[PDB]
Design an enzyme around this catalytic site. Sequence first.
Site, short mmCIF file in Angstrom:
data_model
loop_
_atom_site.label_atom_id
_atom_site.label_comp_id
_atom_site.label_asym_id
_atom_site.label_seq_id
_atom_site.Cartn_x
_atom_site.Cartn_y
_atom_site.Cartn_z
N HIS A 61 0.84 -1.21 0.00
CA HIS A 61 0.00 0.00 0.00
C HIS A 61 0.87 1.26 0.00
CE1 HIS A 61 -2.43 -3.22 2.03
NE2 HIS A 61 -3.19 -2.91 1.00
N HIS A 91 5.43 6.95 6.95
CA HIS A 91 5.14 6.56 5.57
C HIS A 91 4.59 7.81 4.87
CE1 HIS A 91 1.37 6.13 7.79
NE2 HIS A 91 0.83 6.54 6.63
N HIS A 93 1.73 9.18 1.55
CA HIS A 93 0.66 8.93 0.54
C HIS A 93 0.96 9.91 -0.60
CE1 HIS A 93 -1.99 6.95 3.62
NE2 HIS A 93 -1.24 7.69 4.43
N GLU A 103 -3.67 13.58 1.49
CA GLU A 103 -4.96 13.11 2.01
C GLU A 103 -5.69 14.26 2.64
OE1 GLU A 103 -3.82 9.47 4.34
OE2 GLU A 103 -4.79 8.56 2.58
N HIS A 116 3.28 10.96 6.97
CA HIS A 116 2.63 10.66 8.24
C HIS A 116 3.66 10.03 9.12
CE1 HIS A 116 -1.57 10.44 6.22
NE2 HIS A 116 -1.19 11.68 6.49
N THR A 195 -6.18 6.46 7.99
CA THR A 195 -6.76 6.74 6.68
C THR A 195 -6.74 5.54 5.82
OG1 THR A 195 -4.63 7.51 5.78
CG2 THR A 195 -6.05 9.15 6.83
N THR A 196 -6.24 4.37 6.28
CA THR A 196 -6.38 3.09 5.58
C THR A 196 -7.17 2.15 6.44
OG1 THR A 196 -4.37 2.21 6.59
CG2 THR A 196 -4.11 3.34 4.50
#
Length: 257
Positions: A61, A91, A93, A103, A116, A195-196
């Site tokens: 992901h 990590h 996004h 995000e 994040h 958020t996942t």
Amino acid sequence: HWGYGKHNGPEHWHKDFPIAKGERQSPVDIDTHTAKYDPSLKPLSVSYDQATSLRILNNGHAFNVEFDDSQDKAVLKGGPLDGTYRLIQFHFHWGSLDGQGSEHTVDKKKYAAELHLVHWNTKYGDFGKAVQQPDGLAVLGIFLKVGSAKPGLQKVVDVLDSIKTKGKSADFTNFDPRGLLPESLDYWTYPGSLTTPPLLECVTWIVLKEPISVSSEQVLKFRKLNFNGEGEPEELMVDNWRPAQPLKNRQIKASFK
Ligand SMILES: On1cccc(C(F)(F)F)c1=S
Ligand SMILES: [Zn+2]
């Protein structure tokens, strides 16, 4: 299983994770005009001097840079937080194009990516018990814009070739996350969620106002990673972001005037 495609992306998650339509989901749009300055907020304390990175992992992901969180080595405290939160991983996004990828959004503006830095409330003993609590996690969210290179990011970018596909990891010791911070620690804060999937509602979000700048070449390397495993058809790891969710009964607070 879940992902970011047509068939398994954010519009589908609620079927396995009904909390996707919950009361404190993340991310949100930050309406700067509506977010009130709160003078009771404290300055944020980011103490990363003793951070000990261990490994970087492609989890199918995103990629996670993991830290030794077995002692109080790298902590976040102050700001909206009560108590001490320990860094466990960071990590990002990011998008397929520089016009999208973050995000959180700021007045509907999407940044190219979002970092994040994940921390767990040490009053709960470990990460697993902290994600059963409404104040279990604190995530420091930092936007990326494309412009000048971020020198402190280059060690991450250069290792990505070695973890191209899902399930690959590499040694990643002695990385200093202080090199990913912007100058200012002015922030917005609100209660939200992962958020996942599993989308748990555990997180005090602390989103810095000042983005960092990364080069076009740095973010292009993020976009050469793969969601698939080795020996599977190539699907580029891009657009691994969830869109903004309803704010519901929440207020976003500003640490600055
Ligand atoms: O994206 N993502 C994935 C797993 C966990 C989290 C966190 F930080 F909220 F705990 C996030 S933001
Ligand atoms: Zn995240």
